[PDB]
């Protein structure tokens, strides 16, 4: 009657119902955890929802339980729904799968980019998106909570309907999103201050130096992630296209300058250093890739203008090695970069 498979996944497709209430109408994506479907909610006037279905596996169903509690508390601490976190309307246990019902939104920021041939969002869009991220996460931080898994895939457009513009200088078409309003999603790694902090958090590309070096992590972790994301919105490609610790650190040095010595002394990962200098093989493929591809942060600017200088200044502050030294989100919202917003953008 209700069927599964190997890793757990519920056997469902467009047509199938959950709880005699949620009628599946399409697919939205899949992942390591399980699936996300578009449904109609027949107990709420055929409301359009995005239903997340965690797999029927002990530790997944388990971790989902804490995800819900995080969402309960976000919901509970923002009743006006003004702080731009994905809104959970409902959660439930279906024969082993924890399902979480969310408001239905458009494409995530990675998927939009991919479909735009990895051509960057205009700086005004980067500016408005940056501003929402800071606001959302500042709110999360304010509340003893750290996301830990921020990345473009986890940032969703409310509506991703785009305009098509011809780019004169590039001789090709570009997709320009009509509404740059966003929501922060995927709280299945979000962590309270008083809860246990796993040693390693974040997707590698967005993982900060204090985590690699194993110096402990707090809220500033999310700030490092945002720097990475803003660069990625600005250029269209990943800042740290890395698969390995050593390489990652070398990339951080090539791009941001040398690791501060107090962090080298504090870490118990001394296998990376040698007389306070990073040890790596420059003639290996990794070494050559980094040599070829990783230049100082400023060399990535596309324009000299003030608003571009300002973005790159905020970005460097977001990407400070020392987390104690790293800009906070409250300081970020005060930066002369957001003086470029429109009152509609600024007022939320
Ligand atoms: O986890 C959440 O908090 C979460 C919450 C809501 C959505 C979501 C993830 N992922 C979506 N799409 C998506 C895109 C790519 C891969 C995957 Cl697995 C899912 C999506 C789409 C439309 N409306 C809401 C959502």
With 0-12 / 13-18 / 19 or more C-beta atoms within 10 angstroms meaning exposed / middle / buried, residue 156 is buried
Point out the ligand 1 atom lying closest to the alpha carbon of residue 187.
3
Q: Which residues pair with 276 in a beta bridge?
A: none
Of 16, 41, 149, 186, the catalytic one is 149
Which helix (H) or strand (E) element contains residue 167?
strand 162-167
Nearest residue (CA) to ligand 1, atom 1: 186
Ligand 1 atom closest to 31 (CA): 18
Distances from the Cα of 298 to the Cα of 68, 174, 294, 318, angstroms = 41, 25, 11, 14
Question: Of the candidates 239, 255, 253, which has an alpha carbon nearest to the alpha carbon of residue 207?
Answer: 239
- Note whether 2 and 8 are within 8 A (CB): no
Q: Ligand 1 centroid to 51 CA: how many Å? A: 8
> Whole-angstrom Cα distance, residue 91 to residue 151?
24
Q: Quote the ligand 1 centre to 266 CA distance (angstroms).
A: 39
- Judge whether 32 is annotated as a binding position: yes
Residues in the chain: 348
**What is the spatial distance between Cα 254 and Cα 308, in angstroms, rounded to a whole number?**
21
CA distance 177 to 166: 14
User: From ligand 1's centre to the CA of 27, what distance in Å?
Assistant: 10
- DSSP code per residue over 57-109: -HHHHHHHHHHHHHHHHHHHH-TT--S-BPPEEEEEEETTEEEEEEE----BH
CA nearest neighbour of 249 among 215, 274, 217, 272? 272
- The response to whether 77 counts as a known ligand-binding position is no
Which residue lies with its CA nearest to atom 22 of ligand 1? 105
Ligand 1 atom 13: the closest Cα is on which residue? 29
Cα 7 to Cα 18, 33, 312, distances in angstroms: 20, 10, 43
Instruction: Determine contact, residues 280/250, Cβ cutoff 8 Å.
Output: yes
Residue 30, annotated ligand binder? yes
Which one, of 199, 213, 299, lies nearest residue 249 by Cα? 213
Looking at residue 259, the DSSP 8-state letter turns out to be: P
Strand order in the sheet with 97-103: 17-18, 22-30, 34-41, 47-54, 97-103, 88-94
Q: Give the technique used to solve this structure.
A: X-ray
The structure tokens 């991220």 sit at 133
DSSP H helix total and E strand total for the chain: 11, 14
Spacing, Cα 68 to ligand 1 middle (Å): 15
Identify the residues whose C-beta falls under 6 Å from ligand 1: 28-31, 36, 50, 52, 86, 102, 104-105, 108, 156, 185-187
Q: CA 288, 290, 294, 295: dihedral to nearest 10 degrees?
A: -60
Tokens of 77: 């601490």
Distance of alpha carbon 190 from alpha carbon 28, whole angstroms: 22
Q: CA-CA distance, 50 to 27, in Å (whole number)?
A: 9
Q: How far apart are CA 226 and CA 120, in angstroms?
A: 16
Rounded CA separation 226/184 (Å): 12
Enumerate domains of the chain plus CATH numbers: 1-81+86-104 (3.30.200.20), 82-85+105-348 (no CATH)
β-bridge partners, 167: 172
Residue 149 catalytic?
yes
DSSP string, 49-63: EEEEEE-S-HHHHHH
Which two tokens mark 260? 């501060």
For 342, the 3-state DSSP assignment is coil
Planar angle of CA 248, 251, 256, nearest 5 degrees: 120
Q: CA 232, CA 238: separation in Å to the nearest integer?
A: 5
């Amino acid at each position: 009657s209700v069927e599964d498979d190997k890793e757990g996944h519920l056997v469902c497709r467009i047509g199938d119902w959950l709880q005699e209430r949620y009628e599946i109408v399409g697919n939205l994506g899949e992942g390591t955890f399980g699936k996300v479907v578009e449904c109609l909610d027949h107990a709420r006037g055929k409301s359009q929802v995005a239903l997340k279905i965690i797999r029927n596996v002990g530790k997944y169903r388990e971790a989902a339980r804490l995800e819900i509690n995080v969402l309960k508390k976000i919901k509970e601490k923002d009743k006006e729904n003004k702080f731009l976190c994905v809104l959970m309307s409902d959660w439930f246990n279906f024969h082993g799968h924890m399902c979480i019902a969310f408001e239905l939104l458009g494409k995530n920021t990675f998927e939009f980019l991919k479909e735009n041939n990895f051509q960057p969002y205009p700086l005004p869009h980067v500016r408005h998106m940056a501003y929402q991220l800071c606001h959302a996460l500042r709110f999360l931080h304010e509340n003893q909570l750290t996301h830990t898994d921020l990345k473009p895939e986890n940032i969703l457009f409310v509506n991703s309907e785009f305009e098509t513009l011809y780019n004169e200088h590039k001789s090709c078409e570009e997709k320009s999103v009509k509404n740059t309003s966003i929501r922060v999603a995927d709280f299945g790694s979000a962590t309270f201050d008083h809860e246990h902090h796993t040693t390693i958090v974040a997707t590698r590309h967005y993982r900060p130096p204090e985590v690699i070096l194993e110096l402990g992590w707090a809220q500033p972790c999310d700030v490092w992630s945002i720097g990475c994301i803003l660069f990625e919105y600005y250029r269209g490609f990943t800042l740290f296209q890395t698969h390995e610790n050593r390489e990652h650190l070398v990339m951080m040095e090539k791009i941001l300058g040398p690791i501060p010595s107090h962090m080298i002394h504090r870490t118990r990962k001394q296998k990376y250093f040698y007389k306070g200098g990073l040890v790596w093989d420059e003639n290996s493929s990794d070494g050559r890739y980094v040599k070829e591809n990783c230049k100082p942060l400023k060399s990535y600017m596309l324009q000299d203008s003030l608003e571009h200088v300002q973005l790159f200044d905020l970005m460097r502050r977001m990407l400070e090695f020392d987390p104690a030294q790293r800009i906070t989100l409250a300081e970020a919202l005060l930066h002369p970069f957001f003086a470029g917003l429109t009152p509609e953008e600024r007022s939320f």
